[PDB]
mmCIF file of C-alpha atoms and ligand atoms in Angstrom:
data_model
loop_
_atom_site.group_PDB
_atom_site.id
_atom_site.type_symbol
_atom_site.label_atom_id
_atom_site.label_comp_id
_atom_site.label_asym_id
_atom_site.label_seq_id
_atom_site.Cartn_x
_atom_site.Cartn_y
_atom_site.Cartn_z
ATOM 1 C CA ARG A 1 0.000 0.000 0.000
ATOM 2 C CA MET A 2 2.682 2.356 -1.102
ATOM 3 C CA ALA A 3 0.023 2.103 -3.688
ATOM 4 C CA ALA A 4 -2.111 3.756 -0.998
ATOM 5 C CA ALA A 5 0.761 6.027 0.018
ATOM 6 C CA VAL A 6 1.120 7.580 -3.429
ATOM 7 C CA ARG A 7 -2.668 7.213 -3.766
ATOM 8 C CA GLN A 8 -3.524 9.751 -1.090
ATOM 9 C CA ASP A 9 -0.340 11.733 -1.795
ATOM 10 C CA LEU A 10 -2.058 12.464 -5.085
ATOM 11 C CA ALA A 11 -5.637 12.517 -3.749
ATOM 12 C CA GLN A 12 -4.550 15.532 -1.726
ATOM 13 C CA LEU A 13 -2.770 17.151 -4.657
ATOM 14 C CA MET A 14 -6.163 16.729 -6.301
ATOM 15 C CA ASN A 15 -7.204 18.946 -3.395
ATOM 16 C CA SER A 16 -4.443 21.452 -4.242
ATOM 17 C CA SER A 17 -4.548 24.608 -6.351
ATOM 18 C CA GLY A 18 -0.776 24.602 -6.802
ATOM 19 C CA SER A 19 0.834 26.416 -9.685
ATOM 20 C CA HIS A 20 2.109 25.064 -12.981
ATOM 21 C CA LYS A 21 5.709 24.301 -12.021
ATOM 22 C CA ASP A 22 5.148 23.967 -8.284
ATOM 23 C CA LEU A 23 2.338 21.425 -8.345
ATOM 24 C CA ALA A 24 4.241 19.807 -11.205
ATOM 25 C CA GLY A 25 7.136 19.239 -8.828
ATOM 26 C CA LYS A 26 4.767 17.928 -6.173
ATOM 27 C CA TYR A 27 3.513 15.269 -8.531
ATOM 28 C CA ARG A 28 7.117 14.759 -9.620
ATOM 29 C CA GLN A 29 8.201 13.971 -6.094
ATOM 30 C CA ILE A 30 5.295 11.565 -5.796
ATOM 31 C CA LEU A 31 6.297 10.143 -9.146
ATOM 32 C CA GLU A 32 9.925 9.528 -8.257
ATOM 33 C CA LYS A 33 8.647 8.047 -5.011
ATOM 34 C CA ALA A 34 6.617 5.527 -6.970
ATOM 35 C CA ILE A 35 9.590 5.059 -9.310
ATOM 36 C CA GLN A 36 11.884 4.012 -6.499
ATOM 37 C CA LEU A 37 9.449 1.317 -5.514
ATOM 38 C CA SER A 38 10.471 -2.210 -6.416
ATOM 39 C CA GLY A 39 7.925 -4.780 -7.570
ATOM 40 C CA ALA A 40 4.226 -5.570 -7.590
ATOM 41 C CA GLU A 41 3.987 -2.643 -5.199
ATOM 42 C CA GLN A 42 5.737 -0.544 -7.846
ATOM 43 C CA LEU A 43 3.389 -2.055 -10.424
ATOM 44 C CA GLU A 44 0.183 -0.982 -8.727
ATOM 45 C CA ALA A 45 2.012 2.276 -8.117
ATOM 46 C CA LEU A 46 2.138 2.632 -11.901
ATOM 47 C CA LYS A 47 -1.514 1.649 -12.031
ATOM 48 C CA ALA A 48 -2.523 4.273 -9.495
ATOM 49 C CA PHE A 49 -0.291 7.047 -10.855
ATOM 50 C CA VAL A 50 -1.876 6.817 -14.233
ATOM 51 C CA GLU A 51 -5.292 6.486 -12.609
ATOM 52 C CA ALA A 52 -4.278 9.818 -11.118
ATOM 53 C CA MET A 53 -3.190 11.214 -14.472
ATOM 54 C CA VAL A 54 -6.614 10.402 -15.945
ATOM 55 C CA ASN A 55 -8.387 13.449 -14.578
ATOM 56 C CA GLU A 56 -8.552 16.984 -15.911
ATOM 57 C CA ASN A 57 -7.671 18.117 -12.414
ATOM 58 C CA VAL A 58 -4.559 16.479 -13.685
ATOM 59 C CA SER A 59 -4.150 18.736 -16.635
ATOM 60 C CA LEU A 60 -3.270 17.474 -20.031
ATOM 61 C CA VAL A 61 -0.409 19.991 -19.995
ATOM 62 C CA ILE A 62 0.411 18.406 -16.626
ATOM 63 C CA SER A 63 0.189 14.767 -17.576
ATOM 64 C CA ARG A 64 2.294 15.577 -20.683
ATOM 65 C CA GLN A 65 5.545 15.762 -18.817
ATOM 66 C CA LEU A 66 4.395 13.954 -15.700
ATOM 67 C CA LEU A 67 3.827 10.751 -17.597
ATOM 68 C CA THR A 68 6.767 11.554 -19.834
ATOM 69 C CA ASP A 69 8.730 11.232 -16.607
ATOM 70 C CA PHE A 70 6.734 8.178 -15.535
ATOM 71 C CA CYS A 71 7.897 6.791 -18.864
ATOM 72 C CA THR A 72 11.566 7.644 -19.202
ATOM 73 C CA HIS A 73 12.399 5.384 -16.252
ATOM 74 C CA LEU A 74 10.815 2.452 -18.077
ATOM 75 C CA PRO A 75 13.606 1.866 -20.637
ATOM 76 C CA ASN A 76 15.718 1.118 -17.584
ATOM 77 C CA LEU A 77 13.202 -1.321 -16.177
ATOM 78 C CA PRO A 78 12.247 -4.987 -16.697
ATOM 79 C CA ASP A 79 10.720 -6.091 -19.929
ATOM 80 C CA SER A 80 7.886 -8.506 -19.158
ATOM 81 C CA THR A 81 5.608 -6.283 -17.156
ATOM 82 C CA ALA A 82 6.889 -3.381 -19.231
ATOM 83 C CA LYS A 83 5.166 -4.990 -22.204
ATOM 84 C CA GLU A 84 2.214 -5.692 -19.922
ATOM 85 C CA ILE A 85 1.845 -2.127 -18.791
ATOM 86 C CA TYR A 86 2.501 -0.642 -22.187
ATOM 87 C CA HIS A 87 -0.503 -2.686 -23.189
ATOM 88 C CA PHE A 88 -2.695 -1.429 -20.358
ATOM 89 C CA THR A 89 -1.170 2.003 -20.813
ATOM 90 C CA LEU A 90 -2.147 2.269 -24.433
ATOM 91 C CA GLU A 91 -5.568 0.841 -23.643
ATOM 92 C CA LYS A 92 -6.018 3.745 -21.242
ATOM 93 C CA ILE A 93 -4.452 6.257 -23.590
ATOM 94 C CA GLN A 94 -7.493 5.373 -25.670
ATOM 95 C CA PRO A 95 -9.601 8.263 -24.338
ATOM 96 C CA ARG A 96 -7.704 11.434 -25.303
ATOM 97 C CA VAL A 97 -5.119 9.686 -27.456
ATOM 98 C CA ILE A 98 -3.908 12.891 -29.129
ATOM 99 C CA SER A 99 -3.053 14.073 -25.629
ATOM 100 C CA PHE A 100 -0.670 11.104 -25.565
ATOM 101 C CA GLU A 101 0.304 10.826 -29.217
ATOM 102 C CA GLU A 102 4.070 11.383 -29.231
ATOM 103 C CA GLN A 103 4.387 9.543 -25.936
ATOM 104 C CA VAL A 104 2.547 6.618 -27.482
ATOM 105 C CA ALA A 105 4.878 6.737 -30.451
ATOM 106 C CA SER A 106 7.710 6.093 -28.034
ATOM 107 C CA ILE A 107 5.821 3.493 -25.947
ATOM 108 C CA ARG A 108 5.294 1.550 -29.104
ATOM 109 C CA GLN A 109 8.838 2.006 -30.328
ATOM 110 C CA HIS A 110 9.793 0.287 -27.105
ATOM 111 C CA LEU A 111 6.988 -2.236 -27.179
ATOM 112 C CA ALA A 112 7.445 -3.216 -30.795
ATOM 113 C CA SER A 113 11.157 -3.498 -30.254
ATOM 114 C CA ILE A 114 10.223 -5.949 -27.516
ATOM 115 C CA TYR A 115 8.048 -8.043 -29.800
ATOM 116 C CA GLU A 116 10.718 -7.707 -32.497
ATOM 117 C CA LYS A 117 13.428 -9.028 -30.239
ATOM 118 C CA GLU A 118 10.989 -11.431 -28.635
ATOM 119 C CA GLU A 119 10.326 -12.432 -32.259
ATOM 120 C CA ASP A 120 6.625 -11.790 -31.749
ATOM 121 C CA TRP A 121 6.675 -10.416 -35.250
ATOM 122 C CA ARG A 122 2.898 -10.625 -35.459
ATOM 123 C CA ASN A 123 2.074 -8.487 -32.437
ATOM 124 C CA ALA A 124 5.154 -6.430 -33.225
ATOM 125 C CA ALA A 125 4.052 -5.012 -36.555
ATOM 126 C CA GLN A 126 0.430 -5.450 -35.600
ATOM 127 C CA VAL A 127 0.534 -3.218 -32.599
ATOM 128 C CA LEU A 128 2.868 -0.852 -34.384
ATOM 129 C CA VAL A 129 0.154 -0.421 -36.941
ATOM 130 C CA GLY A 130 -2.195 0.679 -34.169
ATOM 131 C CA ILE A 131 -0.815 4.187 -34.393
ATOM 132 C CA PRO A 132 -1.933 7.201 -36.386
ATOM 133 C CA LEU A 133 1.495 8.838 -36.073
ATOM 134 C CA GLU A 134 1.345 11.444 -38.844
ATOM 135 C CA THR A 135 -2.328 10.714 -39.327
ATOM 136 C CA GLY A 136 -2.745 12.188 -35.868
ATOM 137 C CA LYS B 1 -21.435 27.804 -9.224
ATOM 138 C CA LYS B 2 -20.906 31.156 -10.886
ATOM 139 C CA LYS B 3 -17.704 30.827 -12.901
ATOM 140 C CA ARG B 4 -15.328 28.140 -13.854
ATOM 141 C CA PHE B 5 -16.406 28.368 -17.508
ATOM 142 C CA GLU B 6 -17.891 24.908 -17.904
ATOM 143 C CA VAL B 7 -19.038 23.480 -21.187
ATOM 144 C CA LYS B 8 -21.494 25.229 -23.452
ATOM 145 C CA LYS B 9 -22.688 23.728 -26.735
ATOM 146 C CA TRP B 10 -20.053 23.899 -29.477
ATOM 147 C CA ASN B 11 -19.586 23.621 -33.245
ATOM 148 C CA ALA B 12 -17.005 21.744 -35.213
ATOM 149 C CA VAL B 13 -14.817 21.109 -38.201
ATOM 150 C CA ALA B 14 -14.719 19.160 -41.471
ATOM 151 C CA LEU B 15 -13.490 18.887 -45.050
ATOM 152 C CA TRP B 16 -14.474 17.371 -48.351
ATOM 153 C CA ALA B 17 -10.683 16.404 -50.137
ATOM 154 C CA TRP B 18 -9.587 12.740 -50.257
ATOM 155 C CA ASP B 19 -7.536 10.092 -48.442
ATOM 156 C CA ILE B 20 -4.959 9.959 -51.264
ATOM 157 C CA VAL B 21 -1.966 12.062 -52.317
ATOM 158 C CA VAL B 22 -2.817 12.365 -55.214
ATOM 159 C CA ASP B 23 -0.781 15.038 -56.976
ATOM 160 C CA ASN B 24 -2.677 15.626 -60.183
ATOM 161 C CA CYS B 25 -1.338 12.541 -62.031
ATOM 162 C CA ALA B 26 2.236 13.875 -62.112
ATOM 163 C CA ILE B 27 3.150 12.400 -65.546
ATOM 164 C CA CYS B 28 2.004 15.759 -66.941
ATOM 165 C CA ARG B 29 0.066 18.689 -65.564
ATOM 166 C CA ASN B 30 -3.099 18.615 -67.365
ATOM 167 C CA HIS B 31 -4.241 18.107 -63.849
ATOM 168 C CA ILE B 32 -6.184 15.485 -61.999
ATOM 169 C CA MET B 33 -8.471 18.442 -61.727
ATOM 170 C CA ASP B 34 -8.295 18.160 -65.512
ATOM 171 C CA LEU B 35 -9.147 15.705 -68.183
ATOM 172 C CA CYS B 36 -5.670 15.834 -69.696
ATOM 173 C CA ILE B 37 -4.925 15.823 -73.433
ATOM 174 C CA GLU B 38 -4.587 12.057 -73.927
ATOM 175 C CA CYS B 39 -7.307 11.281 -71.402
ATOM 176 C CA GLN B 40 -9.671 13.932 -72.456
ATOM 177 C CA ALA B 41 -9.192 11.803 -75.573
ATOM 178 C CA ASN B 42 -9.870 8.713 -73.452
ATOM 179 C CA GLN B 43 -11.880 10.144 -70.509
ATOM 180 C CA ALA B 44 -13.306 7.540 -68.220
ATOM 181 C CA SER B 45 -15.527 8.912 -65.487
ATOM 182 C CA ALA B 46 -13.012 11.495 -64.297
ATOM 183 C CA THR B 47 -13.608 14.751 -62.478
ATOM 184 C CA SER B 48 -12.046 18.066 -61.365
ATOM 185 C CA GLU B 49 -10.329 16.476 -58.396
ATOM 186 C CA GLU B 50 -10.178 12.836 -59.463
ATOM 187 C CA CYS B 51 -9.477 12.765 -63.108
ATOM 188 C CA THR B 52 -7.689 9.785 -61.640
ATOM 189 C CA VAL B 53 -7.189 9.914 -57.866
ATOM 190 C CA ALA B 54 -6.800 6.936 -55.499
ATOM 191 C CA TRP B 55 -4.413 4.854 -53.398
ATOM 192 C CA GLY B 56 -4.816 2.120 -55.998
ATOM 193 C CA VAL B 57 -2.938 -1.117 -56.609
ATOM 194 C CA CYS B 58 -0.835 1.351 -58.454
ATOM 195 C CA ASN B 59 -1.716 4.267 -56.333
ATOM 196 C CA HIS B 60 -0.030 6.174 -59.164
ATOM 197 C CA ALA B 61 -3.372 7.395 -60.466
ATOM 198 C CA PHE B 62 -1.925 8.442 -63.804
ATOM 199 C CA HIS B 63 -3.955 9.234 -66.900
ATOM 200 C CA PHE B 64 -4.630 6.524 -69.466
ATOM 201 C CA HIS B 65 -1.833 6.941 -71.914
ATOM 202 C CA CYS B 66 -0.319 9.576 -69.695
ATOM 203 C CA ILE B 67 0.246 6.763 -67.217
ATOM 204 C CA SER B 68 1.138 4.866 -70.356
ATOM 205 C CA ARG B 69 3.400 7.810 -71.261
ATOM 206 C CA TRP B 70 5.466 7.738 -68.090
ATOM 207 C CA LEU B 71 5.475 3.990 -68.459
ATOM 208 C CA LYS B 72 6.900 4.772 -71.903
ATOM 209 C CA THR B 73 9.704 6.649 -70.193
ATOM 210 C CA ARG B 74 10.265 3.442 -68.208
ATOM 211 C CA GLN B 75 8.432 0.202 -68.960
ATOM 212 C CA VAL B 76 9.243 -0.900 -65.509
ATOM 213 C CA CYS B 77 6.769 1.537 -64.029
ATOM 214 C CA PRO B 78 8.089 2.562 -60.587
ATOM 215 C CA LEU B 79 5.852 5.634 -60.664
ATOM 216 C CA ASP B 80 4.117 4.024 -57.761
ATOM 217 C CA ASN B 81 5.464 0.694 -59.040
ATOM 218 C CA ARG B 82 2.449 -0.597 -60.958
ATOM 219 C CA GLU B 83 2.297 -0.838 -64.773
ATOM 220 C CA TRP B 84 0.561 2.029 -66.604
ATOM 221 C CA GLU B 85 -3.209 1.733 -66.495
ATOM 222 C CA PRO C 523 -5.551 29.960 -37.867
ATOM 223 C CA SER C 524 -5.420 27.353 -35.111
ATOM 224 C CA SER C 525 -2.970 26.274 -32.399
ATOM 225 C CA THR C 526 -2.934 24.405 -29.090
ATOM 226 C CA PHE C 527 -6.098 24.413 -26.994
ATOM 227 C CA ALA C 528 -7.695 22.594 -24.067
ATOM 228 C CA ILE C 529 -10.106 20.441 -26.093
ATOM 229 C CA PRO C 530 -11.989 18.775 -23.216
ATOM 230 C CA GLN C 531 -13.062 15.154 -23.527
ATOM 231 C CA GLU C 532 -16.312 15.754 -25.409
ATOM 232 C CA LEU C 533 -14.327 17.560 -28.092
ATOM 233 C CA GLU C 534 -12.353 14.342 -28.447
ATOM 234 C CA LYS C 535 -15.630 12.451 -28.747
ATOM 235 C CA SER C 536 -16.870 14.948 -31.331
ATOM 236 C CA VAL C 537 -13.868 14.652 -33.644
ATOM 237 C CA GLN C 538 -13.686 10.889 -33.134
ATOM 238 C CA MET C 539 -17.352 9.899 -33.472
ATOM 239 C CA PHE C 540 -17.708 12.274 -36.379
ATOM 240 C CA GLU C 541 -14.726 10.453 -37.815
ATOM 241 C CA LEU C 542 -16.617 7.258 -37.110
ATOM 242 C CA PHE C 543 -19.544 8.445 -39.240
ATOM 243 C CA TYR C 544 -17.208 10.174 -41.601
ATOM 244 C CA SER C 545 -14.316 7.837 -42.179
ATOM 245 C CA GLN C 546 -17.370 5.744 -42.926
ATOM 246 C CA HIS C 547 -18.204 8.605 -45.297
ATOM 247 C CA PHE C 548 -14.925 10.171 -46.443
ATOM 248 C CA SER C 549 -11.226 10.033 -45.622
ATOM 249 C CA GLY C 550 -8.253 12.218 -46.518
ATOM 250 C CA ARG C 551 -9.935 15.351 -45.393
ATOM 251 C CA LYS C 552 -11.324 14.751 -41.906
ATOM 252 C CA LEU C 553 -12.117 16.414 -38.576
ATOM 253 C CA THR C 554 -9.266 18.893 -38.815
ATOM 254 C CA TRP C 555 -8.961 21.792 -36.371
ATOM 255 C CA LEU C 556 -10.001 25.358 -37.138
ATOM 256 C CA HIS C 557 -10.196 27.961 -34.381
ATOM 257 C CA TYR C 558 -12.302 30.646 -36.042
ATOM 258 C CA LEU C 559 -15.396 28.500 -35.536
ATOM 259 C CA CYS C 560 -14.600 28.877 -31.825
ATOM 260 C CA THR C 561 -16.581 31.195 -29.610
ATOM 261 C CA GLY C 562 -16.750 31.904 -25.896
ATOM 262 C CA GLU C 563 -18.009 29.369 -23.386
ATOM 263 C CA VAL C 564 -18.214 31.329 -20.132
ATOM 264 C CA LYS C 565 -21.615 30.833 -18.574
ATOM 265 C CA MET C 566 -23.101 29.488 -15.336
ATOM 266 C CA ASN C 567 -19.742 27.866 -14.576
ATOM 267 C CA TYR C 568 -19.949 28.692 -10.957
ATOM 268 C CA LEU C 569 -20.343 32.455 -10.944
ATOM 269 C CA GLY C 570 -21.722 35.042 -8.600
ATOM 270 C CA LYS C 571 -22.294 36.585 -11.983
ATOM 271 C CA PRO C 572 -25.549 35.179 -13.417
ATOM 272 C CA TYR C 573 -23.739 35.959 -16.613
ATOM 273 C CA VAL C 574 -23.243 34.215 -19.964
ATOM 274 C CA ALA C 575 -20.687 36.341 -21.838
ATOM 275 C CA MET C 576 -19.727 34.392 -24.957
ATOM 276 C CA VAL C 577 -16.552 35.584 -26.706
ATOM 277 C CA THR C 578 -14.910 35.233 -30.094
ATOM 278 C CA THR C 579 -12.628 32.308 -31.047
ATOM 279 C CA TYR C 580 -9.279 33.193 -29.511
ATOM 280 C CA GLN C 581 -11.136 35.269 -26.992
ATOM 281 C CA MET C 582 -12.357 31.799 -26.006
ATOM 282 C CA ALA C 583 -8.936 30.163 -26.354
ATOM 283 C CA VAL C 584 -7.020 32.725 -24.330
ATOM 284 C CA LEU C 585 -9.709 33.085 -21.671
ATOM 285 C CA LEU C 586 -9.288 29.323 -21.554
ATOM 286 C CA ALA C 587 -5.636 30.172 -20.979
ATOM 287 C CA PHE C 588 -6.759 32.146 -17.896
ATOM 288 C CA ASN C 589 -9.376 30.191 -15.947
ATOM 289 C CA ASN C 590 -8.198 28.749 -12.605
ATOM 290 C CA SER C 591 -4.991 30.663 -11.891
ATOM 291 C CA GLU C 592 -6.666 33.726 -10.429
ATOM 292 C CA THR C 593 -3.800 35.844 -11.740
ATOM 293 C CA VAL C 594 -1.306 35.082 -14.488
ATOM 294 C CA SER C 595 1.674 37.076 -15.662
ATOM 295 C CA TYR C 596 3.015 37.277 -19.188
HETATM 296 ZN ZN1 ZN D 601 -5.532 18.134 -70.002
HETATM 297 ZN ZN1 ZN D 602 -4.955 10.464 -62.010
HETATM 298 ZN ZN1 ZN D 603 -4.514 5.548 -74.329
#
């Protein structure tokens, strides 16, 4: 329940009127907190962070770089559940996809490189072809 | 609730060009807007934005013997890499 | 002329479901973005004002730029 720790850390930043950069750093501290978690706890931390990022109280111009930062640790991180959570990720990028577009481009660079090097050539080019890159 | 500027009714955006390039059947520029010389002479159903316009098996929507013409310049037709049609 | 904008979730649904109907209809031109159809949406938001003062397109966009932050510099 560092799940819960970050959960209410962010439920009370929901209750904050902090500024652009300031509140950004608040969420960034809570991010890097969840980053430095370890395992299944860190996994549901991912879960709950992005469940945080869903709102408009979380701005789009917030979640831009907040989840950019959520992301740029992931190249460093294990591959199995990285595929897993890129899947769930993209499934939940579904709503305002253009809010996520470039970030998705990179997610799927990573993810398709996984399938490529996992030789899951099907799901590789398949789930590459999910994207409207320039057609977004 | 007296201001946070919540959602009124709103009005939106559209087009209609086409989901193709198409670039006016580049082999000449009697356009794809235009029934060109050779294909005003041939003239299938062809109009002021598709005289021939599509992502076809060619996708090089090139006029009848204008497509044949730039297949004349190369009988391997790499125009979009289908043979003149 | 058009640029970045909030585009709340229903605006997503508008472009996308229109593209449902419309990619069904036509593709290549689609639900592009065009500000000058925009006007002001500032109404019974939660206002001591009983006021609905619609504004022009980028009137709308830039007032959008200044909503919650009760003051905002350059
Ligand atoms: Zn002509
Ligand atoms: Zn043509
Ligand atoms: Zn001919």
